[PDB]
Design a protein around this nucleic acid. Structure first.
Ligand SMILES: [Mg+2]
Ligand SMILES: [Zn+2]
Lengths: 263, 15, 104, 40, 93, 221, 1113, 81
DNA sequence: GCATCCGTGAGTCGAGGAAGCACAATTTAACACTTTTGTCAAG
DNA sequence: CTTGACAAAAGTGTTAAATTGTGCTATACTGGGAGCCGTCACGGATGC
């Protein structure tokens, strides 16, 4: 039961389901202490059973319990765990992650197969902890906290921060992801090339694997952090290392529309 | 009605 | 040690009471005026733990030095407020109620 | 993917599922097409 | 592609063993500040900076180059883990 | 009484409790029929139940009565002014002891919490809870700056004497977690209260000199 | 620049008012201007007459009349103050005492009714909204074949939505007719006996069909009295209730006979009489009068069902998707339904209030509590699925939004329960619903557009115009007819050749019930008005539409709604003819009411002296921010002293050029591959476009902040923010708000605010730090509004609302609200999306300097390079034809109007290209230049490619190429010609609303969720990217175990892991090993809340505590 | 016996992976009554707990490989033998 | 064998945030006072 | 290192408001109210 930025209170449906069970339980105790007739006691016990049922699995038996003033059923314990919006599929089998970005993709014809074009402003946020360490290592900032204040305001960013960023990413790779990820080639590791602009440059030969075109598509960006994650991405997930199809064994990074036409 | 708690209660008090 | 297996089983009333740090006896959540958790309610500090680290409800203990202590004035344990994500209560039913999973 | 003997430790089950299901949208739908595969 | 990736893949029976070896060696290099490298001064990876050429800060790059040289030994149960760290600390404080 | 926060069966059971109370107090000598006297208790029980169980955040019965009266007054004024009354009109109509500020505070008191699972958008895949940040647990940036400051303060306290560092760490709660006092600090060391104050002040002056000559600790403030 | 028009079809009638579907429906519902006595029984007047009189059974509350007052505030004020543009509604009601016979009348204020603006939208809580019309099954009696048992049919009786149950009539295999109501089946004989039907009557009426009547002549109940039958039926319908005549009759009367509970509708009643050949007195299945039930439609319905089964020639089944069986519910009808719903709730309180409390001293004002009525009305206009945030990216966007027809919404289908039948193009869609304009995706076929000439009739059925043909000569008599009426005629095609008014062709292409046929002129009865009536307004804006595949035309019409207004917008070089009417009907431009003279012209307003002498001043909407953030302003197009006739243009609105719809620029285009920058829909543009400010748009962002009353103290909007230098406060005025005209970048303060810090003892480290520096902690903290990452511009406006301001209804506890408007002028950049009208779309991938672009021999560089590989697979050849006509127009200096399916053809385009070559090449000859060496090399290749005739002169061969739309093009980098002639022309391209500036987002760390502690989602929340199930599979398939583990724990919800990981990185160390995610701990506690003992064990089966001992008692 | 992919997946020996597929109430109700113990064999169970999946670099075949240089190896062998 | 019923399932990112009063019982606030604590100058 | 004034800085103790909980109304009143409604697959279980 949390207080929102505007001072209003937001609460979960479980509190309402718990209150109903507690209210009915307390009332039954009072009725039993009063020696109420069996008809009243039977109604209270039947309501107590239904209140427990709604708490555990709302709507499974009978009409769903709704919050007065609306017809939206209250979300019970079973609803929390089940379904496409439940705990399993929404929070355990997949998650939202840090060190991730997104932008529109354009074609980079000058790139090598293992390279991508990463915008500088995306890379600045994606590699921020590494950049702060490099800023402190150099004389750009006195400490990590001073360096972080420098990056907060756009007009406070100096031209040596971009030189430091170029050093941070040297040799590292990033993961480029396009939805839907139909097969494992929907994620590939590239060595970023910091570029001016706001769109990600994608190598032409990997568009078929991503099923990507340049009509407005977008991709996500992920930064593996440890040495193990960087080693796996550079060895196993690098685009230049996955040239054949895992499904049929035929080339999957190969000449395409304009390349075929010219040759 | 077995499915309807209200109908079941009304039937019982009507006895 | 490392976790190697996960087991699932039915919980008896005795086991459910061993989990709980106290019985929730009132449907009160918080005070409409002071916004503090109500005693014996669904957000009680005497059951689920303090709302802020190493600070009881009555404001008599306010440091980690009194760690693992329970204030006698308010009854709130002086510990981390993160235990409020892990500590369970319980409701003692006047009469038994079947679990709908094992019925429907 | 490498035209060489598979290496021990590869999740061939996941690869098999992605290989089968990836071209699923290219199957005609209008006993034939994707419905035939689903029934099988 | 990574330099000498074809040769690296041919040095192990499973491609995932190469990643484990590279990832572990990179951690060793970082933990000792690259003072335990088997690479000669003229073999050390370099990065072009505004000031000038400096040692590559990427430890995964260092491990791959060292692994190609053939001066590293990898395997299972080569030495006890505790003794290995103790000796490497002594040799490269 | 349906549609006021309690379900139909909940109203019946609360009413049944008033009916049980009516049988206890009903007096047949008066020759009044049972329904005339019982209807008072049945209604009273139902109304008290609504005042006590209709809201997630319970508002006392007296405050519930004030809220109901304020709603009635606004509704009557609204139908007479041909528009929504302002707090000034409502306060004037409520009577003595009421002003625009009190009318507004009472209305702020009577705001029910919103559900964390209310859908947003035509397709039900987004909810209010998905947009509310958690501001209790420290963020990774906040945790690191706290640990960085502790490390720097530890180094700065190294330049102090063996006892001067203990004095500052004891007085500022850097050891046991809670601040100690001059007398309590003296109890540990056996020195009088006045001397502890001076030695701490000299150490604080020492640290100030070190910080000025390094300026390695001002950024954390 | 002269305009040349193509086409032979003479349209006899102009396009109807494009927004009349919204405007006319709402007028009829309100009837605000009709005198109260002349008001018809429609709209809210029918709602009042249906609920009243409210009788207690002896107080009667009667409704006499209603009236609507003037809106409290004008439309502009409502937008500024977040109000709803509405009129107060009063009802004149009289309370009559049946006992005394005394009448008291007074006018009660019922509430406020939102008012529709002139353009056909609403202002709800300060936001523009549109009520989307809903298509649903028409009420009536329908006869469909039983699928399980061939040869058997079922009769369905359908009332208005939520106005009675659906009734099913079936002939069971036993031969007994069963009536199904509310999922309960029973024999129709019982209900038929209730309606006072005898054995003899059923024999006389339904006994001439065969054995079917014999299955409806069970004498076990015929001898039963109608009263007993009603009691018998009441037991079946609701088993358990004490069978009582008063309760039994009330149930049956309220089920099929109560006009306040069952409503067949005006359309349903009309359809039933048309099908069954009867005349219904009312709109209910049966009438209850004289204390007895009278059948109205059950016997006629059964008679049709029997004869259909028997096989009489004149009876047939119903196509439920036939557009004569599907109707449209407009805003007027949708609003009236919610008015009736809330008005019934108002009556319910009246009855429960007139039976308690001062019975004699009651007045209409005391009885009536209008809160239920207002709540129903506000709910419809706020939380309804059909009440939608208005789409106003450009003038066309809003026009399209008001003509949309949705099959979803309350009372409609479900986005996942709709089959192919509801999503298909029905043959009756011709001329009524556009076959191409629809959302591609999950909503394909569920959202549609009204066709250009179509209008919804009084009953809700779409009609389209047809020209009457008599004796082989087409007359000018136009008839608007529905699909059911259209099926009776042979309708010819609009392109049918006519020699004046007589059909000249001996063979005429026509339709008979939607089937194309070839007939003679004497068999033709009607004619299409024009090809435009088959398509929507958007689709009618695509030139050369007959050359484009429908799959791309769907994209072409949808993308026109996303084009952003430009500061230098231009009307297309090739137009269809609907460009002027779209601007006229959108009400974005300004026109002269009648003849007059312009007296004052200014950037803010225009004053016109009309002939009658009255001065009218028109304020101009300047730099107004729409719902989409695009700037909408009107620019005067007249000068002081200029004479203007009635209807002349006074000022252009957004995206219009001299009254013509201008959604983009006209650019010089070359169709060729260019170094891989054209790859896969990517577009290459010249830097010359940016230099002259083509595709430059103005966008405005609104930032809001509130100062609230708090327990710790009131938040304050101030310039004195703690721990801030003068640089960060440089642009803030004394009031604490950013000055107008300042440029703001990300991280800059817009409004300064301080909030009282919560009482909390500081940590010892920070308490020493403060002691060391001798700084006392302040009681307030910085909580000001800053520019988010990736945003900024120029501050153009600041609005300040304070509590107590006239019309400012701030929330309780809110002291004031500050709104800042930031405008920015966006130029075309890499990653921006461009599109033409033929479905060709792409993002800018490369901006080249002028000297790198291909250029004509005269030195003219092209502006855009398009890949030819996008044409062959898409089959949208209309863009090639547009380019050819654009090339001719470029050199002749003219524009063209080619109507769809009746316009420019290749022979006419080639005759224009021949003229364009004379100016294009004849100019060179006079200048003293011959044929280039580089052109001669290209002409040699061309004849080997079969493009030019061998043996001709270079000039003749160059002309042969030109008539094909191809020119010799030079490479700006080398100076050498492209080895083959290239298709160069002039094309109309739009800058769409999808911009990379609004979509680039990156995050390292930020806000986290409450329960799961995982990162939030959305760029607005500074959230992370979702790593869903399919992404996890890809990492699993790669074998990246450690990469997968990081994203699951260190980067999502491992609270201790992500804290340590961040600290390790900023210290130059490697990230640590992850731990158990917090999501799994939440799962374990949730499984325990279900009474399940979930325990994590070790290799030896001993319990392992994953809660750090924090939950072990 | 022959069964479809849906029935084969739901009758798996791991309740964690079956409960996260579909029919969660049915899977959990039978697992709880039987006291089923999940051995964490497949990929879904390890992903749910945030463990290292037993595939790729997380497989026991390659997971315990060690890397060491000549100088340290000789010292360890020499310092012991 | 068999219908008929119920229950479970149906792609991925993104963007969209109506009593009223009486009275008793309990709690909160405002004094009052004494009792630490923190400084001071000395000494 | 103390050694005595000093002054807030804090705490303890009543007291009175201000808030909150609870009991009580005596003509006779005696069984609710809202859906209404265009999908298709499968098992699996029962009515037998
Ligand atoms: Mg695309
Ligand atoms: Zn306490």
């Amino acid at each position: 039961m949390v207080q929102v930025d505007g001072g209003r209170f937001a609460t979960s449906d479980l509190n309402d389901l718990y209150r109903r069970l507690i209210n009915r339980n307390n009332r039954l105790k009072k009725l039993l202490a009063q020696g109420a007739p069996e008809i009243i006691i039977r109604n209270e016990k039947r309501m107590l059973q239904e209140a427990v049922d709604a708490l555990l699995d709302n709507g499974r038996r009978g009409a769903p319990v709704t919050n007065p003033g609306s017809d939206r059923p209250l979300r019970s314990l079973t609803d929390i765990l089940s379904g496409k919006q439940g705990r399993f599929r929404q929070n355990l089998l997949g998650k939202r992650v840090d060190y991730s970005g997104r932008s529109v993709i354009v074609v980079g014809p000058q790139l090598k197969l293992h390279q991508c074009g990463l915008p500088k402003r995306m890379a600045l946020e994606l590699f921020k902890p590494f950049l702060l360490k490099k800023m402190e290592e150099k004389g750009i900032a006195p400490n990590v906290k001073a360096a972080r204040r420098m990056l907060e305001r756009q007009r406070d960013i100096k031209d040596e921060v971009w030189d430091a960023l170029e050093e941070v990413i040297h040799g590292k790779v990033v993961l480029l992801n396009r939805a839907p990820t139909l097969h494992r080639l929907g994620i590939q590791a590239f060595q970023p090339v910091l570029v001016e602009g706001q769109s990600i440059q994608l190598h032409p030969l990997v568009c078929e694997a991503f099923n990507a075109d340049f009509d407005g598509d977008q991709m996500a960006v992920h930064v593996p952090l440890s040495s193990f994650a960087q080693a796996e991405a550079r060895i196993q997930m690098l685009s230049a290392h996955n040239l054949l199809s895992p499904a049929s064994g035929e080339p999957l990074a190969k000449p395409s529309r304009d390349i075929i036409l010219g040759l | 009605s077995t499915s309807d708690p209200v109908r079941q209660y009304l039937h019982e008090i009507g006895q | 040690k490392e976790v190697r297996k996960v087991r699932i089983a039915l919980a008896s009333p005795e086991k459910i009471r061993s989990w709980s740090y106290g019985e929730v006896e009132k449907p009160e959540t918080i005070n409409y005026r002071t916004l503090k958790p109500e005693r014996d309610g669904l957000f009680d500090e005497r059951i689920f733990g303090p709302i802020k680290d190493y600070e009881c409800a009555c404001g008599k203990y306010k440091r980690q030095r009194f760690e693992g202590k329970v204030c006698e004035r308010c009854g709130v344990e002086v510990t981390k407020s993160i235990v409020r994500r892990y500590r369970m209560g319980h409701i003692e039913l006047a009469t038994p109620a079947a679990h709908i999973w094992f019925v429907k | 993917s490498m035209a060489r003997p598979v290496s021990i430790g590869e999740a061939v089950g996941i690869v098999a599922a992605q290989s089968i299901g990836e071209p699923g949208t290219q199957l005609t739908m209008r006993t034939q097409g994707l419905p035939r595969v689903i029934e099988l | 592609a990574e330099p000498g990736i074809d040769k690296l893949f041919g040095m192990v029976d499973s491609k995932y063993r190469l990643t484990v070896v590279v990832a572990k060696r990179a951690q060793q290099l970082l933990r000792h500040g690259f003072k335990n490298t088997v690479l000669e001064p003229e073999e050390r990876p370099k990065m072009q900076t505004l000031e000038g050429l400096f040692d590559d800060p990427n430890a995964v790059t260092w491990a791959m180059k060292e692994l190609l040289t053939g001066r590293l030994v990898f395997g299972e149960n080569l030495v006890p883990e505790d003794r290995l760290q103790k000796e490497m600390e002594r040799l490269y404080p | 009484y349906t549609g006021r926060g309690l379900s139909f069966l909940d109203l019946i059971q609360e009413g049944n409790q008033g009916l049980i109370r009516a049988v206890e107090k009903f007096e047949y000598k008066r020759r009044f029929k049972f329904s005339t006297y019982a209807t008072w208790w049945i209604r009273q029980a139902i109304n008290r139940a609504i005042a006590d169980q209709a809201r997630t955040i319970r508002i006392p019965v007296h405050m519930v009565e004030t809220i109901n009266k304020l709603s009635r007054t606004a509704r009557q004024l609204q139908q007479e002014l041909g528009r929504e009354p302002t707090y000034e009109e409502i306060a004037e109509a409520m009577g003595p002891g009421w002003d625009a500020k009190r009318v507004e505070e009472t209305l702020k008191i009577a705001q029910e919490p919103v559900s964390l699972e209310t859908p947003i958008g035509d397709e039900k895949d987004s909810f209010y809870g998905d947009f509310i940040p958690d501001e209790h647990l420290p963020s990774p940036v906040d945790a690191a700056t706290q640990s960085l400051l502790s490390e720097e303060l530890e180094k700065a306290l190294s330049k102090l004497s063996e006892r001067e560092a203990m004095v500052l760490k004891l007085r500022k709660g850097l050891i046991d977690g809670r601040e100690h006092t001059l007398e309590e600090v003296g109890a540990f060391f056996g020195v009088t209260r006045e001397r502890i104050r001076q030695i701490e002040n000299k150490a604080l002056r020492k640290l100030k000199y070190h910080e000025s000559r390094t300026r390695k600790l001002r950024d954390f403030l | 620049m002269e305009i040349k028009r193509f086409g032979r079809i003479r349209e006899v009638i102009p396009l109807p008012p494009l927004t009349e579907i919204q405007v006319e429906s709402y007028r009829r519902a309100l009837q605000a201007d009709v005198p109260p006595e002349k008001r018809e029984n429609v709209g809210i007047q029918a709602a009042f007459r249906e609920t009243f009189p409210i009788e207690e059974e002896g107080l009667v509350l009667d409704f006499l009349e209603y009236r609507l007052g003037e809106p409290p505030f004008p439309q502009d004020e409502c937008r500024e103050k977040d109000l709803t543009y509405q009129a107060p509604l009063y009802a004149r009601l009289q309370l009559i005492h049946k006992d005394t016979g005394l009448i008291k009348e007074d006018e009660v204020f019922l509430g406020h009714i939102p008012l529709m603006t002139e353009d056909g939208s609403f202002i709800i809580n300060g936001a523009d909204r549109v009520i989307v019309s809903q298509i649903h099954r028409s009420p009536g009696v329908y006869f469909t074949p039983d699928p399980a048992r061939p040869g058997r049919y079922i009769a369905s009786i359908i009332p208005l939505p939520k106005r009675g149950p659906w009734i099913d009539l079936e002939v069971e295999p036993n031969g007994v007719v069963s009536m199904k109501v509310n999922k309960r089946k029973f024999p129709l004989v019982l209900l038929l006996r209730v309606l006072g039907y005898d054995q003899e009557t059923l024999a006389r009426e339904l006994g001439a069909y065969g054995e079917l009547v014999q299955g409806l002549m069970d004498e076990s109940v015929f001898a039963m009295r109608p009263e007993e039958a009603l009691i018998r039926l009441f037991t079946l319908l609701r088993p358990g209730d004490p069978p009582k005549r008063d309760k039994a009759v009330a149930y049956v009367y309220g089920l099929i006979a109560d006009p306040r509970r069952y409503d067949l509708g005006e359309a349903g009643r009309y359809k039933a009489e048309e099908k069954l050949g009867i005349r219904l007195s009312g709109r209910t299945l049966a009438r209850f009068e004289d204390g007895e039930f009278k059948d109205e439609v059950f016997l006629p319905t059964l008679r049709y069902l029997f004869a259909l089964t028997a096989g009489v020639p004149g009876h047939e089944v119903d196509d439920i998707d036939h557009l004569g069986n599907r109707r449209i519910r407009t805003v007027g009808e949708l609003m009236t339904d919610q008015f009736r719903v809330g008005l019934a709730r108002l009556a319910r309180g009246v009855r429960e209030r007139m039976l308690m409390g001062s019975e004699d001293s009651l007045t209409p004002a005391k009885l009536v509590n209008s809160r239920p009525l207002e709540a129903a009305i506000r709910e419809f206009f706020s939380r309804s699925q059909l009440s939608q945030f208005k789409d106003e990216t450009n003038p066309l966007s809003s026009l399209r939004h008001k003509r949309r027809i949705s099959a979803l919404g309350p009372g409609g289908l479900t986005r996942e329960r709709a089959g192919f039948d509801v999503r298909d193009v029905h043959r009756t869609h011709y001329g009524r619903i556009c076959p191409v304009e629809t959302p591609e995706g999950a909503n394909i076929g569920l959202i549609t557009s009204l066709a250009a000439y179509a209008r919804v009739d009084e009953l809700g059925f779409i009609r389209t115009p047809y020209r009457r043909v008599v004796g082989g000569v087409v007359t000018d008599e136009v008839v608007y007819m529905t699909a059911t009426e259209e099926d009776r005629y042979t309708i010819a095609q609009a392109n049918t050749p006519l020699e004046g008014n007589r059909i000249a062709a001996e063979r005429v292409v026509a339709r008979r019930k939607g089937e194309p046929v070839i007939v003679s002129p004497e068999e033709v009865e009607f004619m299409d008005v024009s090809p435009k009536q088959v398509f929507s307004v958007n689709t009618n804006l695509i030139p050369f539409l007959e050359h484009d595949d429908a799959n791309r035309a769907l994209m072409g019409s949808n993308m026109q709604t996303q084009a952003v207004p430009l500061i230098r917008a231009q009307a297309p070089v090739v137009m269809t003819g609907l460009e002027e009417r779209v601007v006229r009907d959108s009400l974005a431009a300004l026109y002269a009411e009648e003849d007059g003279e312009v007296a004052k012209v200014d950037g803010n307003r225009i004053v016109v002296r009309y002939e009658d002498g009255r001065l009218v001043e028109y304020p101009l909407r300047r730099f107004y921010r729409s719902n989409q953030g695009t700037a909408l302003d009107q620019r005067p197009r007249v000068v002081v002293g200029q004479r203007v006739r009635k209807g002349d243009l006074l000022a252009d609105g957004p995206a219009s050029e001299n009254g013509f719809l201008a959604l983009g620029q006209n650019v010089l285009v070359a169709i060729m591959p260019f170094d891989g920058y054209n790859f896969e829909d990517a577009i290459v543009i010249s830097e010359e476009l940016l230099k002259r400010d083509f595709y430059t748009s103005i966008h405005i962002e609104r930032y809001e902040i509130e100062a609230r009353d708090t327990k710790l103290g009131p938040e304050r909007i101030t310039r004195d923010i703690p721990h801030l230098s003068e640089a960060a406060l440089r642009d803030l005025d004394e009031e604490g708000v950013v000055r107008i005209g300042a440029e703001v970048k990300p991280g800059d303060i817009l409004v300064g605010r301080t909030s009282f810090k919560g009482e909390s003892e500081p940590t010892p480290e920070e308490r020493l730090l403060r002691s060391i520096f001798g700084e006392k902690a302040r009681d307030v903290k910085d909580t000001s509004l800053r520019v988010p990452p990736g945003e900024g511009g120029i501050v153009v406006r600041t609005v300040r609302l304070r509590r107590g301001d006239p019309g400012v209804e701030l929330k309780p506890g809110v002291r004031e609200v500050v709104r800042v408007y930031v405008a920015q002028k966006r130029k075309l950049q890499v990653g921006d999306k461009l599109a033409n009208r033929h479905g060709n779309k792409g993002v800018v991938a490369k901006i080249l300097p002028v000297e790198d672009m291909p250029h004509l021999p005269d030195g003219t560089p092209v502006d855009v390079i398009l890949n030819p590989l996008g044409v062959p697979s898409r089959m949208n050849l209309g863009q090639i034809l547009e380019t050819h006509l654009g090339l001719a127009g470029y050199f002749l200096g003219q524009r063209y109007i080619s109507p769809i399916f009746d316009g420019a053809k290749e022979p006419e385009i080639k005759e224009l290209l021949a003229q364009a070559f004379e100016v294009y090449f004849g100019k060179r000859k006079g200048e003293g230049f011959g044929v280039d060496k580089r052109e001669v090399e290209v002409l040699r290749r061309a004849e080997k490619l079969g493009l030019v005739t061998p043996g001709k002169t270079p000039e003749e061969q160059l002309k042969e190429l030109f008539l094909q739309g191809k020119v010799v093009l030079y490479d700006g980098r080398t100076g050498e010609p492209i080895e083959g002639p290239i298709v160069v022309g002039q094309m109309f391209i739009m800058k769409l609303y999808h911009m990379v500036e609004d979509k680039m987002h990156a995050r390292s760390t930020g806000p986290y969720s409450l329960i799961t502690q995982q990162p939030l989602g959305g760029k607005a929340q500074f959230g992370g990217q979702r790593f869903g199930e399919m992404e996890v599979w890809a990492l699993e398939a790669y074998g990246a175990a450690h990469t997968l583990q990081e994203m699951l724990t260190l980067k999502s919800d491992d609270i201790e892991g992500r804290n340590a990981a961040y600290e390790a990185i900023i210290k130059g160390e490697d990230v640590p090993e992850p731990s158990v995610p917090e999501s799994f701990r939440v799962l374990v506690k949730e499984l325990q809340a279900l009474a399940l003992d979930v325990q994590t064990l070790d290799e030896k089966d001993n319990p392992v505590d994953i809660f750090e001992g924090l939950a072990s008692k | 016996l022959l069964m479809g992919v849906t029935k084969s997946a739901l009758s798996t020996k791991s309740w964690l992976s079956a409960a996260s597929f579909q029919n969660t109430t049915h899977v959990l109700t039978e697992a709880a009554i039987a006291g089923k113990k999940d051995e964490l064999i497949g990929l879904k169970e390890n992903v749910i707990l945030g463990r290292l999946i037993p595939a790729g670099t997380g497989s026991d075949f390659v997971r315990f490989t060690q890397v060491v240089d000549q100088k340290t190896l000789k010292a360890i062998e020499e310092a012991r033998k």
